[PDB]
Symmetry: C3
Subunit: 364 residues, 3 copies
């Protein structure tokens, strides 16, 4: 049985994260999204896995993977969903959307035994987004109607094609979903351990994962669940609160407080800062005194521009989404929902009250 | 013996605190000002206590007070005089101003034995405010001069009276004052021209809570005199504690916190990790103090939260306030002169070299807010992130630059 | 053998430090620069030491030094040449530039035995600044070329001379230089045309303190070489200490403090609670470092205080300074190019990728002040709360936006 993972989108809705990485390598704890997919396919025995990507997303993927077939897309644009065609298979195949996270693999294992065409569906609370599966009287696919303002049922297209899905399901469309899955993963996929190094006068409570070569210095105080990734350097006198995820080689410093945030590879928050309910991408540097607001005065849900459309995040508390290789000056101030583009620089003292462009030098 | 507490001012001079509570419920440690009064009256045996309030806030008082008589004032005319006109007594009564804090009750106990009209006087360093008692050659009340500028003595009206039904006569005689009010003090002045009106000098600690920095004053004094080192709450390891520290029940204090007394930590409060409470920090109830937050000589009222990266010095923060991360208060002027505060539109020295801010109830500050010395921020205000607050801020104001 | 220390420059290049002290009293750890000089002279036995200063600051030097000879410079004519014209010596003398720090004294000891004119030279990486010594075929002084651009060798003038009375002759011969000064180097250049003038190469550590970041340079070196882990002070529990840490007497260090050496904590200082001193923190004397304050690679001079919520990196803060809560120093530029500093009105690279600020004596910053890399702030300045300091700030300036 062949299998295909459909990347090749350009996750615009997941900017600024996707300015610098394909959505396939969105980190969930230590591992990129696509690795979970490959991993769970192999638990069904699949072995021959191909990823449909776009040049010049073309690898990248090659650098990152890893004994797997990388094949590009061509060449009009639409689908659905692609194209599709760039995949070469005779007989059957397993097609899986490359922006899915799913917990168990059991329904994929089950679906590949069948010789009829079959697809997986999943129940959700918000079927008015996603494509709803309408079934006939013998529970086969009548049609997939999409955006149906008037949703016939709660059963939607789970995006695995060759059955109702059981476990945890999430597509990573908008940036705050990066928080969603990472919270879930920290709750479900990993367990209290310490392969790193912790000094005296460090308080630790609840589920705390400390990976190898991670240093945690005196005065630090950790309230779980927390994930501290390999090579990270915490403290002295840091404070990590529940659902802090530091994916790899992160610097958290004196008088710095993190909460319910995903902070990606190599990013550093060295002094006098509070990061709440945020996603900070790779190789970011916060200047001393950089602060993120995560609550609006009226306590209404924080809104975010996603493809130029102003949209509720469904979160009462949401911070910022910082792109890769951003540097903030000292005493920077960032407002709720704000997106800051990859490679931006925020001039000292700035109050960031609007989205900031790729490469922008935002100085007042 | 009946007793009346006069509590139907709108304490304008105590704004912003009084935007959201009657001055009678200004917290001194865990207890409201009026409760100390009722408490100390009962130590004299008084039992029948009535509070003259203004409808509305009639009702408030009803919610808060339990088996004490709540009676409103007549809505036409204002004044302490107008207040007892709504008071029904009898023969004698004990009248006490509802903005007073006094330590011992001994002179009230003493004064209520006499059957002459008598009032209590008290020596202060600034008699040019308050009403000065001028006495005759036999130490009875000649007259009460209001804010004399040329003060005959230091002995001023302590605002505890024992008075007979005759005052109601003199209350009709006298008419409205310069500020549009029916001053009881005028009535007493006629009464002393005369009944013989006896003037008992007060011994202990005395303070009226007129201006907002007096909230700090009494609370320091209470922490120094009325309570003693204890811990009914929970303290983690690596918490340093020095001096007088009171930790009330259900109060959590987390590792890294460092406390230099005297400090009062009220019930339900959550301190740390890595907080720093310095001398005369008063957290009245259910306060959140967080990582890299430092408090000093400040009264922080019910339910207010300072969760990150802030310094609060020499300030009064009222109830259900929220400081955004990085909110700072300045408490010293560049020239080190005494910090000035606008009180009823008048710019006035606080007598303090170090004074921070007075924040009203339900204020929220954004992150990286910066507040200057002496500033008043009105109840329900919102300060925009990054704002520099260099002027008083209105009730409800969205101050955004 | 007489000796003269030349200390009558303006040290303009070392502003703002020199607004309030002569360069001779730039602190290197606990001791002023000149004391190291005197100290190391005496290790050669010299005993009769004179310092050529500028009246006033005559001044000063008298208050700080006895009984070392203090002698002013004369006639509204400047220069090292003008300096020794005020120096009175028959026969020989040792002349040493009063802005030098040198580790060993061995070459001075050696040079004073000779009876020829001799000077010390020293190899450096940047000989295009400084005066290069060109030697003849028998290693005596051919000439000193000033800032050659095409540097013949790496061997430059170390600014220690042994000279005979003959120099006074050559001092009258030569006349004013391009920059309006009487250069002693010109006199020595004539003298070498010739007396035979011997050039001894210097061995150890050598540094002139011309620009403000050199204060950091020597202080790092001193902390690495001249002092060793000890604790004559007091340290509370939950204080972490790593690496070389010097704690002088009457210094208090409170719980939560975390120290990563090498660090020097001068006498009388008060650290913590929850402070964080990182490598090459030098607190020279009586310094206050407070909660949620972090210092790094910085020299912080007598009596200065950083009490709350601040980060000082790669900076020099002079005496009796006060940083308001939330005062931050930026030490890195966005492009990571070397930080530039105005030095005598010329914009100049510091050679440092990471450089913070140079704060003059008696400066006060308001809360939430924000200071940019390379910035100089003049003595006695005041920075208004919330200000972003993005330019040099004047002596006495009230910088408010
Ligand atoms: O109409 C009134 C006026 C005053 N009082 C009561 O008399 C006592 C002393 O009355 P004050 O004369 O101090 O009036 P005030 O408290 O409203 O002062 P401002 O800050 O508004 O200037 C206070 O406890 C007050 O409640 C009344 O009961 N009714
Ligand atoms: O007129 C002078 C000038 C300089 N000197 C002293 O001789 C040595 C050589 O001084 P330099 O002539 O090399 O310059 P400078 O160090 O004075 O530079 P500024 O930072 O002051 O601009 C220095 O230690 C200085 O103090 C004098 O004695 N007299």
């Amino acid at each position: 049985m062949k299998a295909f993972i459909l990347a090749a989108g350009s996750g615009e809705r997941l900017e600024p994260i996707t300015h610098t990485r394909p959505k396939a390598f969105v980190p969930i704890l230590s591992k990129p999204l696509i690795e979970y997919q490959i991993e769970y396919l192999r638990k069904c025995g699949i072995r021959d896995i191909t990823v449909i990507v776009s040049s010049k997303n073309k690898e990248y993927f090659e650098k990152k993977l890893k004994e797997i077939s990388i094949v590009t897309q061509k060449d009009d644009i639409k689908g659905t969903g692609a194209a599709i065609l760039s995949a070469k298979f005779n007989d059957e195949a397993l097609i899986i959307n490359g922006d899915l996270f799913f917990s168990n693999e059991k329904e994929i294992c089950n679906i590949i035994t069948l010789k009829e065409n079959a697809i997986i569906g999943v129940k959700v609370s918000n079927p008015k987004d996603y494509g709803v599966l309408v079934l006939d009287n013998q529970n086969n696919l009548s049609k997939i109607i999409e955006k149906p303002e008037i949703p016939p049922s709660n059963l939607i297209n789970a995006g695995i094609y060759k059955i109702e899905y059981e476990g945890y399901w999430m597509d990573i469309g908008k940036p705050w979903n990066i928080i969603d899955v990472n919270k879930w993963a920290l709750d479900n996929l990993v367990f209290s351990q310490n392969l790193g190094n912790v000094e005296d006068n460090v308080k630790i409570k609840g589920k705390v994962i400390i990976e190898e070569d991670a240093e945690i210095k005196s005065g630090t105080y950790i309230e779980g669940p927390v994930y501290i990734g390999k090579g990270s350097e915490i403290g002295p006198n840091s404070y990590l609160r529940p659902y802090t995820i530091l994916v790899e080689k992160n610097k958290i410093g004196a008088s710095v407080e993190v909460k319910e945030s995903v902070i990606m590879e190599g990013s550093k928050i060295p002094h006098l800062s509070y990061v709440g309910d945020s996603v900070i991408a790779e190789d970011v540097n916060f200047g001393a005194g950089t602060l993120i607001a995560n609550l609006r005065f009226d306590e209404k849900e924080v809104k975010v521009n996603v493809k130029g459309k102003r949209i509720s995040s469904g979160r009462r508390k949401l911070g910022a989404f910082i792109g890769g290789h951003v540097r903030t000056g000292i005493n920077v101030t960032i407002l709720p929902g704000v997106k800051i583009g990859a490679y931006a620089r925020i001039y000292p003292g700035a109050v960031v009250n609007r989205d900031v462009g790729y490469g922008e030098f935002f100085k007042v």
